[PDB]
Amino acid sequence: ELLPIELDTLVGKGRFAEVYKAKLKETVAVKIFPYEEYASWKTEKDIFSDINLKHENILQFLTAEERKTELGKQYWLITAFHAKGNLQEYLTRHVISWEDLRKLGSSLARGIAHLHSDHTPCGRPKMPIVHRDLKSSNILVKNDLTCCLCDFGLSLRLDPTLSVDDLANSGQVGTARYMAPEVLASAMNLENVESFKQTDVYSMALVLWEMTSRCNAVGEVKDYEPPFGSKVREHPCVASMADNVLADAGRPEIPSFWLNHQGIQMVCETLTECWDHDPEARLTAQCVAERFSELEH
Numbered sequence: 001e002l003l004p005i006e007l008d009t010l011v012g013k014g015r016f017a018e019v020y021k022a023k024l025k026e027t028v029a030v031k032i033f034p035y036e037e038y039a040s041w042k043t044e045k046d047i048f049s050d051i052n053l054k055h056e057n058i059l060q061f062l063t064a065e066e067r068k069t070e071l072g073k074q075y076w077l078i079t080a081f082h083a084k085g086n087l088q089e090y091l092t093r094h095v096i097s098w099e100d101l102r103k104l105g106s107s108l109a110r111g112i113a114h115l116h117s118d119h120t121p122c123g124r125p126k127m128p129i130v131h132r133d134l135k136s137s138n139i140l141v142k143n144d145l146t147c148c149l150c151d152f153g154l155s156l157r158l159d160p161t162l163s164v165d166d167l168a169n170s171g172q173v174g175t176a177r178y179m180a181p182e183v184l185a186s187a188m189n190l191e192n193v194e195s196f197k198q199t200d201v202y203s204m205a206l207v208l209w210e211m212t213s214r215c216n217a218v219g220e221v222k223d224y225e226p227p228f229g230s231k232v233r234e235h236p237c238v239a240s241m242a243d244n245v246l247a248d249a250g251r252p253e254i255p256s257f258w259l260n261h262q263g264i265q266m267v268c269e270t271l272t273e274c275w276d277h278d279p280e281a282r283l284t285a286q287c288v289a290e291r292f293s294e295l296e297h
């Protein structure tokens with residue numbers, strides 16, 4: 001019943017699990033959850049097991065397994081392995097081209113638009129998913145320099161059976177640095193879903209800014225810094241983020257010289273709309289995916 005796997009190296013650590021590069025008797029990623037984190041494993045398993053989720057910008061799922069150990073039991077998620085690792089690490093090490101920015105930006109928007117969509121590309125109905133923890137460290141870089149979504153531990157399936165009371169606590173979920181102003185404010189319209197899609201678009205805007213900040217088409221490129229790196233501490237709290245994002249209406253800096261390049265100007269105008277204080281003023285991920293396809297000459 002169990003797959004012939006040999007764990008090689010610890011490559012990552014998420015909030016609920018450890019990620020290993022492994023040999024399948026070829027190279028796969030094994031995400032290992034302890035018994036205590038069973039709910040996170042089940043949440044990811046349920047998303048990855050949905051056949052309607054399958055997309056080139058969503059991490060390929062192989063199987064889930066329960067593995068008895070001497071000390072107890074582990075819960076595994078076996079997926080495709082992307083050697084280039086996460087986008088934050090990638091942008092820290094590399095200065096990207098305009099072409100790289102277009103491929104990474106468009107694949108990110110396509111992946112998010114697919115999660116958010118109530119239909120498959122072929123028109124069949126599907127469950128929308130909201131990621132709820134989008135950030136550069138959660139995005140995998142494929143060998144062809146396109147994006148790939150993973151880490152669905154905090155994700156929510158937008159099921160019609162969802163209660164208004166269940167969505168309350170829950171509470172503020174995610175990484176404080178990437179939380180939308182309405183999440184930081186505890187100002188969400190829990191009465192309507194799609195308000196959750198808008199929070200994912202805000203986080204996507206910060207990621208698009210990170211990609212843009214390391215693109216040689218801007219002219220002079222600075223060393224990589226995460227969004228708000230120069231204003232907040234390493235692991236910021238919701239209060240410190242609220243003071244910046246909400247009270248000071250603070251957003252990562254876009255120097256005027258970046259706008260000299262027509263492509264960079266279009267990307268900047270788009271991401272600026274996507275991080276608007278008002279969730280209703282934000283573009284949809286589908287709109288962003290369309291704007292990136294317009295960048296093709």
Ligand SMILES: Nc1ncc(-c2ccc(CCO)cc2)nc1C(=O)Nc1cnccc1N1CCOCC1
Binds near residue numbers: 012013
């Ligand atoms: N499918 C995968 N294939 C390859 C790699 C990978 C490849 C290389 C390196 C660099 C090592 O020197 C790290 C990781 N990770 C995953 C993966 O699913 N990771 C993953 C899942 N959930 C939460 C966080 C995750 N990580 C995102 C990537 O960065 C670490 C955390």
